[PDB]
Structure formats: structure tokens, C-alpha cells
Amino acid sequence: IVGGQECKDGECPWQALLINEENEGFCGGTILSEFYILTAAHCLYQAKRFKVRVGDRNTEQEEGGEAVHEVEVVIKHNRFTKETYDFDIAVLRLKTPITFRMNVAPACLPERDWAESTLMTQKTGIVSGFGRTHEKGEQSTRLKMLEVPYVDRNSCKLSSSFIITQNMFCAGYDTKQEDACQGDSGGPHVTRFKDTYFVTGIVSWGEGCARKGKYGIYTKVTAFLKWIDRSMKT
């Protein structure tokens, strides 16, 4: 996350971190339930094998409430391809159930039609992760969050070198130096509606980080509510 601020205790409890064979984070995820994590399909390509850490806010200190979970099953959208980055969604079923606690709780899944008219029309959402704090910089050792404005799809298409699909949406800032970044992919974009946070996006991609005239691109979770439901019942 470029700009933004650190997540305090309990503030971003649905964050998950995918860790590679080096025990280093390389992508985020969103806790959906005791057994399921939402992430980006493209993340699955970027480690030989990986596990999930929940409850972490500082990767350099072991803190109360951190736990590690192995993945039993990966469910990757069959239509995902790096050619388009379209359908950038996967669900992970864990071997053992997550114990909810301080800093570990699920984000809500919205109902579809309601979500389109009610969530996707809000001014802003919140993205979080352990990614780089600058385009060419190092990954954050601290969990960060950032409020990002929803961006009009047409302005986003105009700004983009690549095709924006109906399974994506854009968020962030034209020139203000705040955005998600490398290492945040797969992580949560949540939208608050009356005291409750609903998962609305998966951090997917960007042309650099916080570039002038470029936005952040997110997988549109409302496009996949049925798919996610079927995956969590498999």
C-alpha cells in the first residue's frame, strides 16, 4: 500500500496473507468464513507452494493472535488467464477452521442485486495489505489500509493501456500518491454500508503503483457471488 496508514488492532480483521516457501508474504486474501479465503487467481501462479497467515499486523514481530493455516483445496476460476487478467478470482479451502478472535474475522458477502445498487454506488471502499509502500520499494512490514474512491468505468478505460472488463472495477486516485501495490494483490477491497463491511473487490492489478493518470484495478466480487457460493459448498 502506497500512502494510507497502518491498520490498528481489530481494524482490518478479514485480512489474510499468503506466504511462500520462504515464509514471506507475496499476496493477500480475504477471510470469508472459518474455512474459506478469497484471493486472486493470478496469485496462485506466483509461489511454488503456499500457506495462509491470519491475524498478523507486523511481519517482523510474532504477535498474539497470529495463526498459520494450510490449504486443502484451491478453486481457481477456469476462465482466468494472464492474457487478459479477466476472471481474477480464486477461493481457498483451508485444512482446519480459523478461530475468530481479535484481528481475525470474516468480511461479509453481499447479496448480488442489492450489492450493485447499494454497495457499488458508495463513494469509497477500503483496500488493505502488506505490499510495497512505493512502486520500486520494499514490502511493508506493517499491515496497511487505504481509502480509495470508486472511479467511473469510462474514465478508467480512458486511462488504461489494457482492457477493463465487466468483471473488473477501478478505484483510487488520478494523481494523489496513494494506491495498492505489488504484494497487495489478492487482498480485500471492502465497502462499508451502515456499520458493516462487505467484500466488494479483490486487489487485481495496476500499471505500476500510484502513477499519475492511472488507477487501481479490482476484481468485481458482485460479478462472482454465485460462483463464490458454489465454491464454498464444494
Binding site: 475468530f100 481479535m102 461479509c108 447479496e111 447499494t118 454500508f193
Partner: protein, 42 residues
């Protein structure tokens, strides 16, 4: 109409719904200590 004030529903919309970990009271009430989409307190 949910068109105006979400039909007064705290969450989903008249008929109101809530996400898992909540029950319909209009309002939505947690059924446990860590309901979805709520920031956690010590």
C-alpha cells in the same frame, strides 16, 4: 422500495435479510462475538 433508505433494512433488502452471523431483529443482530464485517474490539 429498498429504493429509499434500503427499506430501512440494516443490511439486505419489502423483506430484510442479514449476512451470516446475524439475525433479523429491520435491524441486524450479531449471533456471536465475531460477526462478519465488524471491526473487532478487545
Amino acid at each position: 422500495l429498498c429504493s429509499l433508505d434500503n427499506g430501512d433494512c440494516d443490511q439486505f433488502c419489502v423483506v430484510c435479510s442479514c449476512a451470516r452471523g446475524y439475525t433479523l431483529a429491520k435491524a441486524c443482530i450479531p449471533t456471536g462475538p465475531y460477526p462478519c464485517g465488524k471491526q473487532t474490539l478487545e
